[PDB]
A paper describes a structure:
Previous work has demonstrated that one particular kinase, known as cyclic guanosine-3′,5′-monophosphate (cGMP)-dependent protein kinase, or protein kinase G (PKG), has essential roles in multiple stages of the parasite life cycle. The cellular functions of parasite PKG are regulated by allosteric and cooperative binding of cGMP, similarly to how mammalian PKG is activated. In contrast, PKG enzymes of Plasmodium and other apicomplexan parasites have an extended N-terminal domain that features four CNBs upstream of the KD and are monomeric, resulting in an effective regulatory stoichiometry of 4:1.
Here, we describe the complete atomic structure of PKG from two human malaria parasite species, P. falciparum and Plasmodium vivax. Interestingly, all three Plasmodium structures display a swapped domain arrangement, in which the N terminus of each protomer in the dimer interacts with the active site of the other. All three of our Plasmodium PKG structures feature an activation loop that is both in its open conformation and unphosphorylated—an uncommon combination previously observed in rho kinases and rho-associated kinases such as ROCK and MRCK. Although the domain-swapped dimer in our crystal structures suggests the intriguing possibility of an intermolecular regulatory system (in which each protomer extends N-terminal residues to block the substrate-binding site of its dimeric partner), the totality of our biochemical and biophysical data indicates cGMP-free (i.e., inactive) Plasmodium PKG to be predominantly a monomer.
Author numbering: 0 to 5, 8 to 13, 20 to 318, 322 to 461, 463 to 543, 545A, 546 to 603, 606 to 816
Amino acid sequence: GMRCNEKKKAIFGEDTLMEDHLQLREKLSEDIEMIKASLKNNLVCSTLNDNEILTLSNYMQFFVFKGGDLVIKQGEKGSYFFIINSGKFDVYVNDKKVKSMGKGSSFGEAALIHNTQRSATIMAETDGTLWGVQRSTFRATLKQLSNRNFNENRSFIDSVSVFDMLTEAQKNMITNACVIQMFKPGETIVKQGDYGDVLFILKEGKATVFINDKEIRVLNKGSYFGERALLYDEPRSATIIAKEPTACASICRKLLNIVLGNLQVVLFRNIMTEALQQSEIFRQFSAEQLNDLADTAIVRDYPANYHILHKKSVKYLIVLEGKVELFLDDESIGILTRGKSFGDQYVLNQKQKFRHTVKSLDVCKIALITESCLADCLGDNNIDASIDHNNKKSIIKKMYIFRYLSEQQCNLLIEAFRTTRYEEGDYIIQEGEVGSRFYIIKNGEVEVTKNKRLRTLGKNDYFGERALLYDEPRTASIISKATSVECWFVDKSVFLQIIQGPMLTHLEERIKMQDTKVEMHELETERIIGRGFGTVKLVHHKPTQIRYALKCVSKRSIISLNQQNNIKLEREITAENDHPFIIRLVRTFKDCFYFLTELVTGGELYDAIRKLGLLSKPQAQFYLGSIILAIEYLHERNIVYRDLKPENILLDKQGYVKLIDFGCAKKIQGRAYTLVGTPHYMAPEVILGKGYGCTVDIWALGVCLYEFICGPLPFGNDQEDQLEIFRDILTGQLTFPDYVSDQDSINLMKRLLCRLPQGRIGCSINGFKDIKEHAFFGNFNWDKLAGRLLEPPLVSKGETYA
């Protein structure tokens, strides 16, 4: 009997105590009504409907205690929330008796929001029992309720035909406008003849339809009605009455108009945008431009066999319904069905005579875009020139170098483009030579080469942009690899006449820092500039003499709080950020993790506002405006920041802002539920645990504006206890001091600090447009902000760090 000659591995606070007291107990009517009563008064649960509270009530657990047994200690980490069922319980703060609690009373309120160290000890005087629930269970139950409600409502949005032409984002936005409405047997949901404006969808139960007091049919779960009442003012065709207990998801037109705008206008824009984008011309148009074409297009119904067009200043034609046949003279050239379109030729050549014929094959609906309709869309009568102008604008607005310049700067630059032609085999650029030109390929193809082939570029690609910022050797060659290639080009001399010093300095310094492929051994630490988490060192790169910042995240710090999956997700977000008002990552290192970023030398915004005192309107516009662009950028990439506060905003050498610290930031996929952020800045929806998204940063924006204009924080300014901060956030009164003289500032603050996201400015389908166009910003040039053409509020004299 031989043995195994290997080896075999071995195996190895408040929740432990409540386990000793837990017992099974069937809940009666009297128990449920007590729970229901107690939760209706609770900070988080007061807004919840009966079915939500009844669900939460069921997850409560029975805990039996003897007189003298410990329930809660003072200084231990909190977790349970309690409702006293029987007996008496005494509260001893600092080993000193204060209150005596009995049947109906509650304690451990804060535990339902976050892990908090308790204040006092609760002891049991007589033999008594508690109804209890943990945080985990409570937050999980609130998550599941709201999340399933949302998913169920969205499926019903999908089953309703009138919403078919809404986008993903539009459907998700109106899913939140769904209100659940309960009807007992006998209750009439809608009555024949009433001008109602509400769609209804049966989740569970059945309801009977009555036209003229006569039963037509019965309606089962999934059946819906009132979709026409979201579009038009019309009487109800029927009287719908509930047969059994029924739950209805409902959408009112009033809320839809707030959230989405006019539903007919939005649907048509989507239909028209999709059609117009089939043409290569209108793909380059902006969303606004296409929306304008949709709003002003002439819509017409034609009978069959009608000459819609023959030999009229129509340039483009879209089939909304039916079929039309296209003719060149007597030759049929094709049939256009629903969604197809015609007119590329005439859109591009404004003055060209319409040579084609369009004839309806059946009864049809057609959208027509005229010459005036394009001119109004584009802002001038020279359609051919504007389309060319915009084609170029679309190309350069994708490049960092050009996309943040003012519109006036961008227009002048486009106008300065000159065209040249090349024979096949011509070196457009030769490597090693010093360039002074930026190129965009109009026609043909080119080959990028070095020392062998690297790439191939064609129509609307670009190259050589670095020559506008630097005097350096071309790292590659550009050989014309086609028949007769044409490039648009702009000279450096022209670029330098258009761009001004501050923007040029920003670009010079920013594009350079990707070139320096640094290594850890090439960095020398000058001084420390931050502490924590870890430490931030100012470092000096020996080869290039460029100065950087080096954050030092410790391994033992990250592994302690289990932030394993969060540091990798943080690196991803931080690396992808490429906006002028967001910190730019250079590279990372490991051995402790490291972030190498650009050096920001003008200190925190926390200190700047404290140097300035109360900000004037122009100063608040500048800083809040700057934060808006950074936050907008992140929201467009589905990133919620979650920790917006002045501490997390640095100022650069020129006085422009840099958003830092993306530890709390997250790539949003649906509704987020985790409680993160800094309490004073946290949005109500985060605290209430029913789901949130990018809208939280807009609340935070409001908190910042309040600090800027008013001085103190709007909620919990005096408070240190986190429970009392959240309370003031949830139910406190928003007030403004007597020295705040600006009506528009207060209006904006109130609407940014709207508790429910649906009524919050910037949280509708228009997004930040509504914030940017608010009267507070009436005299504010957003165009000049991004391009660094505004005097900032404060310019730092020398460098400044914490």
